[PDB]
Amino acid sequence: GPECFTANGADYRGTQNWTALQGGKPCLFWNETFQHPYNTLKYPNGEGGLGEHNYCRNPDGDVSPWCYVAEHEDGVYWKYCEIPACQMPGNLGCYKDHGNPPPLTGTSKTSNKLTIQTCISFCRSQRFKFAGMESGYACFCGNNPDYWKYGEAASTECNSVCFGDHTQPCGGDGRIILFDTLVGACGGNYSAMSSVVYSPDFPDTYATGRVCYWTIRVPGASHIHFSFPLFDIRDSADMVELLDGYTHRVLARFHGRSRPPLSFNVSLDFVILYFFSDRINQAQGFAVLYQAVK
Amino acid sequence: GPECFTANGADYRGTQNWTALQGGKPCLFWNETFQHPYNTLKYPNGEGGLGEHNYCRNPDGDVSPWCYVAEHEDGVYWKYCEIPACQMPGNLGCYKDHGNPPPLTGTSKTSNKLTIQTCISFCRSQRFKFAGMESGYACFCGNNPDYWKYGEAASTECNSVCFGDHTQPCGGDGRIILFDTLVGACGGNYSAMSSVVYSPDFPDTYATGRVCYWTIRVPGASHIHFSFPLFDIRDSADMVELLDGYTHRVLARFHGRSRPPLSFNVSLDFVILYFFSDRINQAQGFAVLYQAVK
Ligand SMILES: *[C@@H]1O[C@H](CO)[C@@H](O)[C@H](O)[C@H]1NC(C)=O
Ligand SMILES: *[C@@H]1O[C@H](CO)[C@@H](O)[C@H](O)[C@H]1NC(C)=O
Ligand SMILES: *[C@@H]1O[C@H](CO)[C@@H](O)[C@H](O)[C@H]1NC(C)=O
Ligand SMILES: *[C@@H]1O[C@H](CO)[C@@H](O)[C@H](O)[C@H]1NC(C)=O
Ligand SMILES: [Cl-]
Ligand SMILES: [Cl-]
Ligand SMILES: [Cl-]
Ligand SMILES: [Cl-]
Ligand SMILES: [Cl-]
Ligand SMILES: [Cl-]
Ligand SMILES: [Cl-]
Ligand SMILES: [Cl-]
Ligand SMILES: [Cl-]
């Protein structure tokens, strides 16, 4: 399994305790980091994934997980962690852009409030299957499957902040962070054996008055397994439902105060996922992973 | 009064019968243009503004009005008309872009479905007050009031088609057609002595399930005059309402089958304009001009 389903590894809870597996420095313990803000005293109760360990975390909503190295005359107290297993489904990686010809050869925009979703959405409208974000404000679309052409980069090189949301990475100069344009669409058809479906506008907070239906139709499936590796909802009014495709009967309903079980199975090959959002509130959103069985 | 409230002078009904007032050629009569498609036989009943005259018209939904010149070995049967009075409120003109520094110095996009409204909307989101369209696909934002810096051009130089809608002009290479970003917004506050308010997404067809309120609040006005120099609605379900700001009482309601009077007055300084749109249909839209009185 991948270990983060957020854009910035907010949700990373794994056990990496080096800034990098290769060439890295080791993390300080969050229960000894009292010279800094971020430690188990400020965050008892396990807030932020912090606790009696030295694992990489991101409790300051930065653009990626990190930890405190301990300064070596460098002047550098902390570093971002480069965690290859922490890469949200739909994030295709960080690649080098050497200019002409660029990696994605569709159509572009630049934006003072650019975010990942904003880039994805522009690209999606345009009928392109990939979106690419650079230098915090630039956005590129394209159907090129050879975006990887000029070589992959370490994800820490794609850490320039999104101009629109300082909690999201938007690539780096010469560096472009690539996303599948399906991520966060309001509805869809799905047929794959398994895939992930995120809230509308993920990783941005889901817009107001959203109403989305996603059909998951897997002919030949005897039953389908659902799990929620992410689930943030603020309001009881905001809802996620599962509907029998044939009957439209409501199999399950999950809201701010109803919390999705570990997993559940549905005895159907045809299910609809339904999401209704309150105007008044928006929250982090969710991610649901479905696995079909033959 | 300005003589067109559309982007392409579809609605021009004035009496210009030269391709241009200065240096131009004269128009053929639409009731003699039988060697061409466009004539009073194909269009009896005055369709398209065509009839027993030689006035500039645009019945083929091209990007601007035109007429048939009559060929002079040129090989050229028709030309666009350059009509200075036919310039929809909000269209700020056609200007020269000489590259660095460009006329609008905000932020830009390029788009395979670019239209005027699309450009306006991008710019509007970004908090810029002007949008500029070039070469049919390019879109530029900015707050520069000196966009006119490199000189104005004849509107016929901004006639490259919008990639997204072949009925709209999207500038020309080296040429940029400028719009106020208020045009077609879904709602607003208005205070001016008078101004024009267009359908949502004008000049594109109004999106589905639109619900818009515009407040027109002119303190000191004894009463306010309303007229509709444009009104296309396909469905009875699609509606425009006027509401007493103080009471929210419905002063007037206009829909596909209810047709706005010449003018009407309201004995108030505070009125709300309300627009509800059916999912099923979208139409050309409307333009309403209000004049406050002291
Ligand atoms: C913090 O917890 C770590 C890991 O369990 C432990 O090794 C260390 O001694 C603890 N230090 C304090 C001050 O609790
Ligand atoms: C990383 O994880 C655990 C403690 O949480 C421990 O076994 C291991 O020694 C840690 N690595 C380092 C370098 O401290
Ligand atoms: C067409 O109408 C014009 C303008 O009224 C007139 O001058 C002309 O003789 C008419 N021609 C025909 C064929 O009706
Ligand atoms: C333009 O308009 C009217 C006829 O519709 C006429 O008075 C005038 O002569 C026309 N001009 C030309 C050049 O035909
Ligand atoms: Cl710090
Ligand atoms: Cl504290
Ligand atoms: Cl490099
Ligand atoms: Cl956009
Ligand atoms: Cl449905
Ligand atoms: Cl023709
Ligand atoms: Cl015919
Ligand atoms: Cl020039
Ligand atoms: Cl209201």
Cα B186 to chain centroid, rounded? 16
> Which token pair is A94?
């960080």
- CA–CA gap between residue B75 and residue B247 (Å, rounded): 64
Alpha helix positions (H), chain B: 116-125
User: Between residues 206 and 245 of chain A, which touch chain B (CB distance below 8 Å)?
Assistant: none
Distance B24 CA to ligand 8 centre (A): 40
Measured in angstroms, the CA of B133 and the nearest CA of chain A are apart by 14
A54 interfacial to chain B (CB closer than 8 Å): no
The domain B1-84 having CATH identifier 1.20.1740.10: the answer here is no
- The span from the CA of A194 to the CA of B6, in Å, is 49
Q: How is residue A129 annotated by DSSP?
A: S
Residues B178/B184/B188/B192 CA torsion (nearest 10 deg): 50
Instruction: Collect all residues of chain B within an 8 Å Cβ-Cβ radius of residue A109.
Output: 108-110, 122
Nearest-angstrom CA–CA distance, A56 and A54: 7
Neighbours of A191 (CB within 10 A): 11
The per-residue b/e assignment along A23-51, b for 16 or more CB within 10 angstroms, e otherwise, is: eeeebbbbeebeeeebbbeebeeeebbbb
Domain boundaries, chain A: 1-84, 85-184, 185-294
Please name which ligand lies nearest the alpha carbon of A54: 2
DSSP reduced 3-state for A279? coil
Q: What angle do CA B8, B168, A141 make, to 5 degrees?
A: 165
Do the beta carbons of residue A62 and residue A167 sit within 8 Å?
A: yes
Q: Which amino acid residue places its CA nearest to atom 14 of ligand 1?
A: A31
CA distances from A195 to A182, A226, A264, A286, A288 (A): 11, 10, 16, 14, 8
Both tokens assigned to B227: 């007229």
The pocket of ion ligand 6, defined by CB under 5 A, consists of A 42
| B126 vs A contacts (CB less than 8 Å) | 111-113
Strand partners, A62: none
Residue in the block written with tokens 């509606």: B239
Q: Are strands B211-217 and B188-190 parallel, antiparallel or unpaired?
A: parallel
Cis amide bond preceding A101, omega within 30: yes
For B209, nearest residue in chain A (alpha carbons): A209
Identify the burial level of B166 via C-beta atoms within 10 angstroms of its C-beta, where 0-12 means exposed, 13-18 middle and 19 or more buried: middle
Ligand 2: which of A18, A19, A40, A54 to mutate, most ligand atoms within 8 Å of CB?
A54
Give the whole-angstrom CA distance, residue B220 versus residue B216: 12
CA distance A88 to chain B (A): 27
Q: Do B112 and A122 touch (CB under 8 A)?
A: no
